[PDB]
Amino acid sequence: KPTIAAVGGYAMNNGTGTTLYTKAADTRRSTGSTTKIMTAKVVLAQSNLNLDAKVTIQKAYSDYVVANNASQAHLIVGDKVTVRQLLYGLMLPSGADAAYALADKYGSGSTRAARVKSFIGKMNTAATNLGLHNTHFDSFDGIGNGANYSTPRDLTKIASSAMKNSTFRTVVKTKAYTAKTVTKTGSIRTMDTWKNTNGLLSSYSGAIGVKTGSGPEAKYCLVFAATRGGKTVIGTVLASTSIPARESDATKIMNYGFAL
Ligand code: NA
C-alpha cells in the first residue's frame, strides 16, 4: 500500500466499481473547488441544455471573484460567452466567475439570487440521487460555508458519474483552450489562453482527468482518472499538503491501482 500525504484518499476501477485504494475514504472533509465537478455535472444534465447558448457576462460575476479573491477565467463584463466556453472556463482554470454564470443560467427563479439558491438545491439533489450520504453543498464553487463537505468515496462516485458524459470527458482532458468571445460591440475577441490546472495531464501517461481543488480548509485536493490497457482508475485525494504533493499522492495511488 502506498503512503500518501493526503489525509483522505480513494480509488476504484471506474468500469467495475471495485475499490482499489482506501484511506479514511468515508470521513467527511471540506471540498473547496473540487465542488465545481458537480456544477458541471448538473449543468450537463439539464433538459434545456444548449452548448451553443450565449451568456452575457454580468458585473456580478466579476465582483464576486474580487470579493472572494477566488480563482477566475477572466471573463469580461459585457461579453457574450457560450455555455460550452463557460464549461472550459469552469474546469480548466477553475473559474469561479464562470461557475456563477452557470448557476445563474441554469437555476430556476426570477432573480439571480433565487436562481443560484435553486441551482445549489439541484447540486444537493443530484447527490442524494447518487445515493450519497456524506456530501452536502452550500455553494456553486466550493467557496461557501463549512456546510460544504464530502468524502474521498462520494466525490469519486460523483466524478465517475460525470465521466459518463462525453462533453465532460472532452473538457476535463483538455490541457489548453482559447475562448473566442463576442464583445459588447459585436466584435470577436481572442481571450488569453486557459491552461488546465491538472498537471497529471502532462506528467502521467494515460491521464484523462479530472479536476484539482483547494481552499483554506480543504487544502490541496485532486480528483484523478487515468486509463491504461482498457482499464481506467478513478479516485480522489483530499487535503494533501501542496500542489506537488497532491499530484504525487495521486500518481502513487494510480500506479498502485494499475498493478494490483
Ligand atoms: Na486549484
166 is catalytic: no
Residue 76 C-alpha cell reads as 469580461
47 is catalytic: no
Residue 213 C-alpha cell reads as 481543488
Residue 115 C-alpha cell reads as 436562481
Fold classification of 1-260 (topology level): Beta-lactamase (3.40.710)
Q: End-to-end alpha-carbon separation of the chain, Å? A: 10
Identify the CA nearest to 33 among candidates 232, 153, 210.
210
Helix or strand or coil: residue 5? coil
For 49-104, give the DSSP string.
Answer: --TT-EEEPPHHHHHHHHHHT-----PPTT-EEEHHHHHHHHHSS--HHHHHHHHH
Judge contact between 209 and 224, C-beta under 8 A.
yes
Rounded Cα distance, 260 and 249, in Å: 17
User: Which of 36, 122, 219, 252 is the catalytic position?
Assistant: 36
Rounded Cα distance, 87 and 95, in Å: 9
How many Cα atoms sit within 13 Å of 50 on the Cβ side? 7
Q: How far is the CA of 6 from the centre of ligand 1 (A)?
A: 15
Rounded Cα distance, 139 and 172, in Å: 21
Resolution (A): 2.2
User: Which of 94, 139, 214, 240 is the catalytic position?
Assistant: 94
Identify the CA nearest to 31 among candidates 153, 160, 150, 164.
150
105 is catalytic: no
Q: How far is the CA of 198 from the centre of ligand 1 (A)?
A: 8
- Only one residue has cell 465542488, namely 35
Q: How was this structure determined?
A: X-ray
Residue 3 C-alpha cell reads as 503512503
Judge contact between 6 and 238, C-beta under 8 A.
yes
Rounded Cα distance, 152 and 141, in Å: 18
Burial code (b: 16+ CB inside 10 Å, e: under 16) for 121-130 equals ebbbebbeee
Burial category of 111 from C-beta neighbours within 10 Å (exposed 0-12, middle 13-18, buried 19 and up): exposed
Q: Give the residue extent of every domain in the chain.
A: 1-260
DSSP state of 33: G
